[PDB]
UniProtKB/Swiss-Prot annotation, chain B:
EC number: 1.17.1.8
UniProt-annotated catalytic positions: 154, 158
A Pfam family: DapB_N
GO biological process: diaminopimelate biosynthetic process; lysine biosynthetic process via diaminopimelate
Cellular component aspect of the GO annotation: cytosol
GO function terms (MF aspect): 4-hydroxy-tetrahydrodipicolinate reductase; NAD binding; NADP binding; oxidoreductase activity, acting on CH or CH2 groups, NAD or NADP as acceptor
Function comment: Catalyzes the conversion of 4-hydroxy-tetrahydrodipicolinate (HTPA) to tetrahydrodipicolinate.
Residues engaged in binding NAD(+): 8-13, 34, 97-99, 121-124
Pathways involved: Amino-acid biosynthesis; L-lysine biosynthesis via DAP pathway; (S)-tetrahydrodipicolinate from L-aspartate: step 4/4
UniProt protein name: 4-hydroxy-tetrahydrodipicolinate reductase
Amino acid sequence: LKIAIAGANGRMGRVLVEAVNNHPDTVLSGALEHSGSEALGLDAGYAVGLKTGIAISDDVDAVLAQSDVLIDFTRPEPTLKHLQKCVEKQVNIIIGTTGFDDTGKAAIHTAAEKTGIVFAANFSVGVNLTFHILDTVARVLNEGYDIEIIEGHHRHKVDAPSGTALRMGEVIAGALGRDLKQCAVYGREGHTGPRDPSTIGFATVRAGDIVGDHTALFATDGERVEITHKASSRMTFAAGAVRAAVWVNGKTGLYDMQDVLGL
Amino acid sequence: PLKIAIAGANGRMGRVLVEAVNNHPDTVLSGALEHSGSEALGLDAGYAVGLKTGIAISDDVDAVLAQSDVLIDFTRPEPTLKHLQKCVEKQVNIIIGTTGFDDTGKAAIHTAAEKTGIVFAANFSVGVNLTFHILDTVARVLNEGYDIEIIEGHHRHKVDAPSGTALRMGEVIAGALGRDLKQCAVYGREGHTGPRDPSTIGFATVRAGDIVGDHTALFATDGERVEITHKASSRMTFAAGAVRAAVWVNGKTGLYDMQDVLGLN
Amino acid sequence: TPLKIAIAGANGRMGRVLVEAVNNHPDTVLSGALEHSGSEALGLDAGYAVGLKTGIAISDDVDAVLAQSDVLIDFTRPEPTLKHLQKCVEKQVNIIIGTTGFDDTGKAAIHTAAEKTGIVFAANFSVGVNLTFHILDTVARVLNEGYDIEIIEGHHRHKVDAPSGTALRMGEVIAGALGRDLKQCAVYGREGHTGPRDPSTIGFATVRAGDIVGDHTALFATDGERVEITHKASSRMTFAAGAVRAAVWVNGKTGLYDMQDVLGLN
Amino acid sequence: TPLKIAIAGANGRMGRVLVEAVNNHPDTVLSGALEHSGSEALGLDAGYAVGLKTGIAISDDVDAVLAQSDVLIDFTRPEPTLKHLQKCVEKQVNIIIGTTGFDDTGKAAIHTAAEKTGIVFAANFSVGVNLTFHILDTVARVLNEGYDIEIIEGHHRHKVDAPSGTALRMGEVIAGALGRDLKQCAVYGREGHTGPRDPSTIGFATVRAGDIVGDHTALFATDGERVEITHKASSRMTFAAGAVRAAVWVNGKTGLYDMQDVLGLN
């Protein structure tokens, strides 16, 4: 199966090149980038230490006609432009880009009538499984358990808490009939007093080169239940994106990552 | 508010059950049994736990069960089977946390369950029973290319390795992946082991200090790790589950277990 | 031959664990069990609620009990402790002070009493927490360039202050070793666009949940590795066992000491 | 001002991280990049894959790297390193030797070469692992009565030997401090009725899974608490950062040293 990778020289895109090689039902077809990046006219797998056999291109027109699926983990605005050409050639698209416009969301809904799209904020199999299970854990442990979300990332991370940590909070709040904006706590200083049963606490660590560590804690008199996900590199997201690409065998419509996983 | 009797009220596990009944909003302590010739007969049930329950520690099974909706029993098989017959007689429900019944004893509980409501379970922790359920889901989703390890920690006095819990976790994961536990389990690694076989379910056991019971199921692949963890802080884990089972079964007939109590059917 | 130990506040939560700690230690025996007069527990055996037959009755007679004792262990309040301290000086008995919240006048009275008796006065009696403070000094000095420092901490829901006295003291040891000021460089939570982390920052992440006795971790992180120094308390026995060890240690000594002296880390 | 550092085997996995380590240190500068005789990447920029512009073409000519360099870092095999050492001694240059598993003749060759030049020869280059070994000595001596010792270790699925060289070395430091023999008191697994654990046992729990670089924890446990000392490796940068630090440290020394000397732990 022929897969194209957008932003092929960027940090995420190089891992996607390795992910296509690792997966058997897949082989590498395209490699797009920005018009003007030094990337152009080099082997896609040269960064990772393979012989890709394909040149990094800046031809959205040419490349999409050969490839069956496109994967995009780039900046949001070029993605809508990439989406438009992908509709035309009857080609599937996996959208990894997050932090997206409200009018932009409607463009993907409309584009889903023409071809198959898997739209998700996080592409890890483990993180998506964690979201599902937190729903079950929250419902069973719904009286007398204190909920905390502990999270660790590298020193360069700008936003706290992560999109993942907040999404974990939304699943737990939604299952317990709470509002996250009303009952979240992001830090503790001084006499925080007795903890309110309704609170969902967020403890955030920013240090070193941590890829992304997330734990959801449920605590009561007698026990603690912890659901933890730990990312070792960006390969976690790439492996899930390639799996989502395999999953769309000509399918049409919009899918969450929960659909590929069967949840 | 539901009236609860505690068997073995002066024992370590009975004292935690007195606190568990107090802590729960829907329950109140109505009786506290101990054997005849206990040094604690006549004393308030909460004497060593800072509570004035207003209930004297008794050996009168007849009088105490007449004032009670549910009996919670973590004692021994012979006294439990004796309590079970008086529970059938009075129409009291019974939470059986006692272990080591034979096949005759188990049959007696099955027969008694036609007349009254029973929750009979090997483990009463809410979190451990929930963990068993989730591992089934986690194993099926992560069934290709994830290495499975069960890490476990207990106090120095623990005789069996791995724990009943750790082995039961292994059985749920093996059963979901179509593997056989006897043939693919590994309990240690020493020397030149070689590369790990994908099919192996490894067990790492820690025996140290005063650890009540720490269990983790690890799923690892290239790129990530998923850990499902349970940590027990004291005996309150089992008491709080038993009190929840008492609330659940009130006014029912039949035999149930923790899977029924937590709605995981 | 055995060391004779008296326990103040013997019916309180801390006093009950100290009765077990004195029993557990091979070369100590319980000699007395004090409580205030009009306690509900006067007359009863010291071990009544912990399953022991110690053979000593819970008393309110400070004079009579200290006459039969080598050491007193006191985790009560400052006014009763200062009253006990005066009787300890009079009867030539050592004292282990686990009590907090003294005045400067109370603190001066402990210094003066230490000319005449042996005293171990410490904020924390855990062996492992006191050891942790010491090694963080070494770890901070070696890992002084390019390591981000975070202090992660977890306690039960009823705990009032964040971060704990322990967590802040960990921060003070690390800041002191790196020539930083904790008031200037601490961060207690993160929300929104925090930006990139400043190299000087000492971050504090605090968890409040369930019945956690006290979990503390000091994290040192850089490109390539992570070093974690962690202490986990399972119960109050951590403090009791250290206090009993301080009692054994100070026997036959005079002067003022702390846990650093008991553990040989000075 | 900055120190001139040369890198051997710059296209190999370890050398790529070393190029990034040389940049990331503020007062070190890349001077050269040596490679084996007749490599497939001569002529290309040294930081060609590691993402920065070194301005240096990859060479396989010993001469350029030996000259106009203050220090050489070598993580190759026994054969090339002894040949590099001969040229390094001749040109008055320091060397950081990161190769492991020397021959007995090769170890003697390093000893006499250290009479003319500065050498840092060490089995592990991680700052955190070497610091862990030091601290375990202190922790074991303080926690020598009534604490159960366990060593928990986790590595990737491809790791052949259990436990790791690091895990066993941790065990040797703890055993040596407690006057125990590791061969006599180690336990590597538990199955069946293990019974109530012997106080003298040092247990080893080994995890083999996924892509774990190397996680090591030393646990000390008693009634009431737990002390954990943990080291976690994120990548090969762990070793590279220590090698560059060793290079800075040997900035005008002559002789044989190891990481204990670099970190001031004597």
